[PDB]
UniProtKB/Swiss-Prot annotation, chains A, B:
Residue ranges occupied by any HD domain in the UniProt entry: 34-136
Keywords: Acetylation, Cobalt, Hydrolase, Magnesium, Manganese, Metal-binding, Phosphoprotein
Cofactor field: Mn(2+); Co(2+); Mg(2+)
Single Gene Ontology MF annotation: 5'-deoxynucleotidase activity
Protein name as annotated: 5'-deoxynucleotidase HDDC2
Residues binding a divalent metal cation 1, per UniProt: H37, A65, D66, D131
Summary of the function given for this chain in its UniProt record: Catalyzes the dephosphorylation of the nucleoside 5'-monophosphates deoxyadenosine monophosphate (dAMP), deoxycytidine monophosphate (dCMP), deoxyguanosine monophosphate (dGMP) and deoxythymidine monophosphate (dTMP).
Reactions performed catalytically: a 2'-deoxyribonucleoside 5'-phosphate + H2O = a 2'-deoxyribonucleoside + phosphate
Self-association and partners: Homodimer.
Homology family: Belongs to the HDDC2 family.
PROSITE patterns reported in the protein's UniProt record: HD (PS51831)
Annotated organism of origin: Homo sapiens (Human)
Cofactor descriptive note: Binds 2 divalent metal cations. Shows activity with Mn(2+), Co(2+) and Mg(2+) but shows no activity with Zn(2+).
Length: 188, 188
């Protein structure tokens, strides 16, 4: 609403200054931001084929997935925040965020978030897998940068059984194969 | 193409580690990444109304706009790279990047880039304004964080006359008004 839109964009801009917590807790130097994370998710929504999904909706879901974190921060499992409490803080943040927009936009964005957070669609479940896959890609990238192959194994373990999209699964298996030989190599 | 898609995503992931040069050259501490920049552009494509534009195309344009920088880096005017040379390096990078994708995706992304870089559509000119507006928003955000109002005036000056979209113009004028009084305030 001019002033309001500006305020909205300043809130979203805070995502640039939310470091992704899972890396912080592992002492990764200069960790990616939450917006870095969503950026690569959105691109993945563009380039990972699934001709059953509204891709346009997938992209938007990716750009809204973690948007609430501009206010709540990036909660990691090590924060031990109960599921219900995380949901509450997130809902409260999206309502602040989206009500700076006019009704049509407020509605569209709030429901975008609602769909991803509820995982109430095929698109949403796809984008969820993008999130997880982007995360383990990023873990291998930090292992490489650190020259400590295998150091971030806990991220890979955390995603056991969470991948069911055919295209994402072979991407993940390619990654893991490459990484496993990088690990066996460095052991000699 | 499994291995290729992975390679594509690793290239795009490099955008996380390209600091935006205009801030580096002004000694901004912990400057945003190029993907941070595109992230907020894409959101702006979603929330700044223009019911003459394919918004879906605008979002994608925003996500591809600076993608070539994962290879060429983020060139600033202070680098003094001739227009033609910048174009060449960019084209060469997109061709590397997009040919890791299958034909339909290679084509779609290459032409997305081609459209923004050529500014050959209304959508492209809109997204260009998003880029510039996002940039000056970010300059005010760094001025605030630094408690040095006005320090990044050169960014504002650099955008004189570049805004013609009605919604973006009042956003920009709101910003500048707010900033100008922040500046007059601090002077007392
Ligand atoms: Mg998250
Ligand atoms: Mg999170
Ligand atoms: Mg997050
Ligand atoms: Mg979280
Ligand atoms: Mg998370
Ligand atoms: Mg640029
Ligand atoms: Mg640039
Ligand atoms: Mg750039
Ligand atoms: Mg540039
Ligand atoms: Mg630039």
């Amino acid at each position: 609403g001019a002033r309001s839109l500006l305020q909205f964009l300043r809130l979203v801009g805070q995502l640039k200054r939310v470091p992704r917590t899972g890396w912080v807790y592992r002492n990764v130097q200069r960790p990616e931001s939450v917006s870095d994370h969503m950026y690569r998710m959105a691109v993945m929504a563009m380039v990972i084929k699934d001709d059953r999904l509204n891709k346009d909706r997938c992209v938007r879901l990716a750009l809204v997935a973690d948007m609430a974190e501009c206010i709540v921060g990036d909660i990691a499992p090590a924060d031990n925040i109960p599921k219900e409490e995380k949901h509450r803080r997130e809902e409260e943040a999206m309502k602040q965020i989206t009500q700076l927009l006019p009704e049509d936009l407020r509605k569209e964005l709030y429901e975008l978030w609602e769909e991803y957070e509820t995982q109430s669609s095929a698109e949403a479940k796809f984008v969820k897998q993008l999130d997880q896959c982007e995360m383990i890609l990023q873990a291998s990238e930090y292992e490489d940068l650190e020259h400590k192959p295998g150091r971030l194994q806990d991220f890979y373990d955390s995603t056991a059984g969470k991948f069911n999209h055919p295209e994402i699964v072979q991407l993940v298996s390619e990654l893991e194969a490459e990484r496993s030989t990088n690990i066996a190599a460095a052991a000699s």
